[PDB]
Amino acid sequence: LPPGWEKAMSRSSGRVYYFNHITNASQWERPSEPARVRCSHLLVKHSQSRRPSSWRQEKITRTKEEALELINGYIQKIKSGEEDFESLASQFSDCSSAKARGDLGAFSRGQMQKPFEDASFALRTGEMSGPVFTDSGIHIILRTE
Numbered sequence: 001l002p003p004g005w006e007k008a009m010s011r012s013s014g015r016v017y018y019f020n021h022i023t024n025a026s027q028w029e030r031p032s033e034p035a036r037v038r039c040s041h042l043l044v045k046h047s048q049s050r051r052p053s054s055w056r057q058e059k060i061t062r063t064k065e066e067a068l069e070l071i072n073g074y075i076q077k078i079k080s081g082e083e084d085f086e087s088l089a090s091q092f093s094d095c096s097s098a099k100a101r102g103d104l105g106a107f108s109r110g111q112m113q114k115p116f117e118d119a120s121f122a123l124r125t126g127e128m129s130g131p132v133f134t135d136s137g138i139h140i141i142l143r144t145e
């Protein structure tokens with residue numbers, strides 16, 4: 001199984017699924033390294049973020065737990081198709097790359113915060129991470145190239 005993937009047991013259903021401990025992705029289906037990748041992301045910040053401030057909100061006061069709740073909500077909508085990633089990144093992301101549908105352009109190892117870099121290189125083109133934690137807050141990452 002590709003870098004990071006383990007079989008897990010569904011607690012609700014008792015059906016096996018696959019969890020990726022690097023990207024925090026999970027899916028039912030069995031899963032399937034470049035110099036550069038390209039990604040967008042949706043950042044939800046919280047009170048312990050490196051900079052508890054964004055274009056959306058001058059003083060961010062939400063807790064870590066509330067941020068993770070928001071992130072989970074958006075992952076569910078993206079996954080159900082009720083909303084797409086670019087749209088929720090544009091409206092809700094606490095990064096100013098929100099202006100570019102959450103796009104951050106191409107990058108190699110060595111430029112991004114490490115949990116974000118690892119998650120970004122462990123994704124395949126087209127794939128989305130689960131919640132990725134860095135000192136800026138909680139990310140959903142979409143690998144676009």
Ligand SMILES: Cc1ccc2cc(C(=O)O)[nH]c2c1
Pocket residue numbers: 043094095096097104112113114116117134136
């Ligand atoms: C790893 C990583 C990469 C890009 C960004 C951009 C932000 C921000 O705008 O807060 N945080 C990051 C962390």
